[PDB]
Amino acid sequence: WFPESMRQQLSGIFAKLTKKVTLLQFLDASDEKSLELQSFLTEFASLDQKITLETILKDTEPAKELLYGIEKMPSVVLLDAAGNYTGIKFSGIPSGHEVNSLVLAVYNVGSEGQPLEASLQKNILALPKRKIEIFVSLTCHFCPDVVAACQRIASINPHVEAEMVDISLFPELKKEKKIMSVPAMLIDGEQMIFGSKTMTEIIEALA
Numbered sequence: 767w768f769p770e771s772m773r774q775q776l777s778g779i780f781a782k783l784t785k786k787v788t789l790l791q792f793l794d795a796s797d798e799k800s801l802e803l804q805s806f807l808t809e810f811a812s813l814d815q816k817i818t819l820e821t822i823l824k825d826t827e828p829a830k831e832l833l834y835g836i837e838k839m840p841s842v843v844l845l846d847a848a849g850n851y852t853g854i855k856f857s858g859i860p861s862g863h864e865v866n867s868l869v870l871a872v873y874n875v876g877s878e879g880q881p882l883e884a885s886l887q888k889n890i891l892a893l894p895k896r897k898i899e900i901f902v903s904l905t906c907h908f909c910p911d912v913v914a915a916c917q918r919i920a921s922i923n924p925h926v927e928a929e930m931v932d933i934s935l936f937p938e939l940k941k942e943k944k945i946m947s948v949p950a951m952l953i954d955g956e957q958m959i960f961g962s963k964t965m966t967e968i969i970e971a972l973a
């Protein structure tokens with residue numbers, strides 16, 4: 767899944783990791799996309815000692831599934847070093863260009879993150895409880911930026927959750943919610959917001 771070209775870049779980033787991180791997949795052994803995700807994550811986890819992949823079979827741990835709100839499949843969530851749910855989730859496989867999203871989520875959970883303005887970080891911490899779904903395709907070039915911003919907010923604010931959704935895996939959901947444009951944010955199952963958005967714009971929408 768990862769060319770040595772990528773591994774050169776990812777090692778630069780993973781060198782910055784100061785805290786351990788756990789990727790927890792809920793694996794349905796009878797679903798091909800779950801097995802693909804397992805193959806992807808196994809290789810991804812091998813990129814750094816601080817990244818652990820753990821596997822739980824779907825429908826064996828209902829208390830955990832409740833705790834992490836596991837609905838869409840395939841599914842993987844991010845846990846911090848202490849074992850706590852960061853609110854960061856991927857529904858589908860974040861392969862192709864979405865590797866960017868997974869890398870940034872791991873970086874933000876396994877480090878202190880990039881220097882940020884007190885103005886921005888105040889607003890992030892000030893945000894109320896919220897659940898964000900970021901709909902993407904694997905070939906959408908502007909999608910990872912939006913995903914990474916929302917999931918960075920989730921990594922800082924304990925009440926914000928940010929779920930990447932590969933919309934091409936959920937065609938019925940695409941019609942229902944009317945995801946027409948390629949990157950789309952859905953907040954608390956209500957307000958749709960399409961197109962690229964800055965951190966400050968996202969924070970405002972979350973306010």
Ligand code: PRO
Pocket residue numbers: 782880881
């Ligand atoms: O990798 C690091 O540690 C530095 C910190 C700010 C930007 N990069």
